[model samples]
Target: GCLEFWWKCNPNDDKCCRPKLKCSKLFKLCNFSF
Candidate 1:
């Protein structure tokens, strides 16, 4: 399953974000943009 906004994520992983959201490299969290 994908993660929601602000959820922690691995910056090297690309399949963790939900739908249109993206994982941030700086904060290492899922959000609208990186």
Candidate 2:
């Protein structure tokens, strides 16, 4: 994968219609499908 931005992310809190990316590089998962 690659580096990306956030909700302040070219969109704000209720900006986008979908959701995810709820973590950091320190973030983890049990993780990933699409």
Winner by lDDT:
1
lDDT (10s digit) by residue, model 2, range 1-34: 2323343222223322234443333333211223
Clashes of each: 0, 1
Residue-level lDDT tens digits of model 1 in 1-34: 6667777777567645577567766576676642
What TM-score fits each model?
0.46, 0.14
lDDT accuracy of residue 19 in candidate 1: 72
Q: Rate the local accuracy (lDDT) of all candidates.
A: 0.65, 0.30
Error of 2 at 11 (Å): 12
